[PDB]
């Protein structure tokens, strides 16, 4: 609603231009007349104080044991039906003291404890679902840290980050930004790394959900979480929703699923609507990451739902060296290990294997209370990770 700050962010002069001065003095004159305008009338008309008298009378009209209940329906204004504490419905009378605006059908209502009526709305406790996927800040991974993938970082920048920092570009050519991005590649290529990189330099509520939690126990509590996921995203202003391992909504079978595949499909048919249905969309951008782009219904990937398909290949030899350097940056090597010699250990190392080598190297140096990794540590590190 209204914003307490930012009375007039007219910083267009951005200098000592006199235009800044004229507006400021305007309020000062209005303030002066208001001062004696309120106190003067507050003496010969000592009916309402507006500071202690106003609040006082309403409190008496309220009750000491204020009740809490659920508003069930909105009958004509000044009248509503509110569900009592346990199981009863009362045709209460709405009092004007309430804002009369936050009366959503089912949020909350405060009622007098004897003549039950509407006395006031109650803000709804942050539902546990919102807190579950409300990623605050990406801990450490920056955007120059990712390294390697270069032509693939421009697509994500140009779909989920540019339209929020420089909208003019998709503002003068009359082109709406590409709807979504789907990331696909072998197991371990930076798919999620780039996914959390965008969360770093972003100004929107990031939400993350893995494909495995989209499949639930009871029937119907399937394509109902999908509705909740996109209901939270809309309520939270600009937001990037990240679905990870989307290939778990029909690639993995779980006994907890009361309904079998037939139930999982209806989850997809609800996810299909939530990405492109005849409802309004607003500002919500979907990033889907998967390691098997060939095992999902070719309608979830239809242009319009997800537009830009980004392909993540196994690291190139030149990029392999960059991966080692970034991961080994904060490591006191023993000027005896050569990075180039370990670049060729197996025909194709994902890159997540590179970090595994550089992380097991340290654990192989801790065992000897040594703060310098030698070629022996890496040699045994390169065998304990990608061999067994």
């Amino acid at each position: 609603g209204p914003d307490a700050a930012s009375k007039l962010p007219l910083v267009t002069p951005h200098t000592q231009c006199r235009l800044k001065l004229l507006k400021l003095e305007r309020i000062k004159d209005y303030l002066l007349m208001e001062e004696e305008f309120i106190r003067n009338q507050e003496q010969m008309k000592p009916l309402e104080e507006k500071q202690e008298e106003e609040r006082s009378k309403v409190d008496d009209l309220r009750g000491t044991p204020m009740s809490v209940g659920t508003l069930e329906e909105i009958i004509d204004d000044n009248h509503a039906i509110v569900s009592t504490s346990v199981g009863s419905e009362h045709y209460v009378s709405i009092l004007s003291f309430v804002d009369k605006d936050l009366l959503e059908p089912g949020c909350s209502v405060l009622l007098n404890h004897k003549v039950h009526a509407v006395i006031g709305v109650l803000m709804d406790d942050t539902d546990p679902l919102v807190t579950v996927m409300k990623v605050e800040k990406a801990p450490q991974e920056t955007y120059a840290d990712i390294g390697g993938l270069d032509n693939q970082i421009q697509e994500i920048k140009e779909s989920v980050e540019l339209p929020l920092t420089h909208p003019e570009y998709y503002e003068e050519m009359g082109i709406k930004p590409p709807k979504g991005v789907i990331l696909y590649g072998p197991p371990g290529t930076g798919k999620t790394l780039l996914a959390k990189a965008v969360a770093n330099q972003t100004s929107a509520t990031f939400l993350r959900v893995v494909g495995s939690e989209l499949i639930q126990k009871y029937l119907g509590d399937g394509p109902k979480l999908v509705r909740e996921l996109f209901r939270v995203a809309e309520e939270h202003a600009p937001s990037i929703v990240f679905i990870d391992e989307i290939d778990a909504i029909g690639t993995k079978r779980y006994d907890s699923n009361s309904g079998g595949e037939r139930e999982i499909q209806r989850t997809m048919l609800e996810l299909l609507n939530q990405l492109d249905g005849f409802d309004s969309r607003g500002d919500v951008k979907v990033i889907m990451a998967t390691n098997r782009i060939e095992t999902l219904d070719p309608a979830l990937i239809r242009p319009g739902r997800i537009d830009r398909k980004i392909e993540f290949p196994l690291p190139d030899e030149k990029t392999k060296k960059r991966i080692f350097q970034i991961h080994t940056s904060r490591m006191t090597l023993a000027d005896d290990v050569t990075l180039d010699d370990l670049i060729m250990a197996k025909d194709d190392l994902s890159g997540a294997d590179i970090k595994a080598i550089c992380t097991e190297a340290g654990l192989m140096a801790l065992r000897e209370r040594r703060m310098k990794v030698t070629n022996e540590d890496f040699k045994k590190s390169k065998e304990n990770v990608l061999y067994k």
């Binding site: 200098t15 000592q16 231009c17 006199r18 235009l19 004229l22 507006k23």
Partner: protein, 331 residues
């Protein structure tokens, strides 16, 4: 009060400047020779801002606050040589040593004499030399004088020549957004005689560059909104924007014609002798401009019809203008 690393530099060359009080006796010729040569080399190392903090500037800041307060009027003698050197050190400490409420008694310190040819010194600097201080001072002293002592000596009119000089160079200094800086100073001064001051400012600015005058008109729109309570600047304020957009500027006149409507739209004395001035803008936006001025359209045909020769067609044109082209085209 202390120095490090480069301590040697500020030690040897400072004894002579500090020896001035003791060098004025028995050494009549020593002082003059050193000053002449030091001036040339000083500017080379000053124009470059390679040091965040000025080491030399702070040294004199202390003794200059009190020494200059009583020494300046101590002599009160006009000398050809002393005046040039004296004015040099007055401007340097103004921004920092002088506090905001100190220009009340500063009228006699700067009005009496000018700093020689400081114009060259005010061109290299962008906005930090004297632009901030110069404008603020005139906003207070002048107003009080005109309240009851508007009649004064010729000194009041001397400052008029000063105003014109500044505007001629600020616009082209950088061609950046700072161009809009000039109008602020002229507004405060000459509240009543605003027209006379503006006549000189735009006389030279328009000739220097042609197209860079359009941006100026924009600042005029918002300026008039914050007018005075008294109903005295409702007519004079609306006349200034006209002369600039005349034949002295681009002949588009699209905004010129609109400018006449501000003075309550007194059509009897603003454009009544304006349509026939050009006689060659019939196909231009001249016709369209009047199409948004439904204030004196009834009397338009009173003079236009009697012409019967200024226009190729004089009867058919008027008929098809009212609503013939409005409803038919859309449907």
């Amino acid at each position: 009060m202390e120095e490090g690393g480069r301590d040697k530099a500020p030690v040897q060359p400072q004894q002579s400047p500090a020896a001035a009080p003791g060098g004025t006796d028995e050494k009549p010729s020593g002082k003059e020779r050193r000053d002449a040569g030091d001036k040339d080399k000083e500017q080379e190392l000053s124009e470059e801002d390679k040091q965040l903090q000025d080491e030399l500037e702070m040294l004199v800041e202390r003794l200059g606050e009190k020494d200059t307060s009583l020494y300046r009027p101590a002599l009160e003698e006009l000398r050809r040589q002393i005046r040039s050197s004296t004015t040099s050190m007055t401007s340097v400490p103004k921004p920092l040593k002088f506090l905001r409420p100190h220009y009340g008694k500063l009228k006699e310190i700067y009005e009496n004499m000018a700093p020689g040819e400081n114009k060259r010194f005010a061109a290299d600097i962008i906005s930090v030399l004297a632009m901030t201080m110069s404008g603020e001072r005139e906003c207070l002293k002048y107003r009080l004088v005109g309240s009851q002592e508007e009649l004064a000596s010729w000194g009041h009119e001397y400052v008029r020549h000063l105003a014109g000089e500044v505007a001629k160079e600020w616009q082209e200094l950088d061609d950046a957004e700072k161009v809009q800086r000039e109008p602020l100073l002229t507004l405060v001064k000459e509240i009543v005689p605003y027209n006379m001051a503006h006549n000189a400012e735009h006389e030279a600015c328009d000739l220097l560059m042609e197209i860079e005058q359009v941006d100026m008109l924009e600042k005029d729109i918002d300026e008039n909104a914050y007018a005075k309570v008294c109903l005295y600047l409702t007519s004079c304020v609306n006349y200034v924007p006209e002369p600039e957009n005349s034949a002295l500027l681009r002949c588009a006149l699209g905004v010129f014609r609109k400018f006449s409507r501000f003075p309550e739209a007194l059509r009897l004395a603003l454009m009544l002798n304006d349509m026939e001035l050009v006689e060659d803008i019939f196909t231009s936006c001249k016709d369209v401009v009047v199409q948004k001025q439904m204030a004196f359209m009834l009397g338009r045909h009173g003079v236009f019809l009697e012409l019967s020769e200024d226009v190729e067609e004089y009867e058919d044109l008027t008929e098809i203008m009212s609503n013939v082209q409005l409803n038919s085209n859309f449907l």
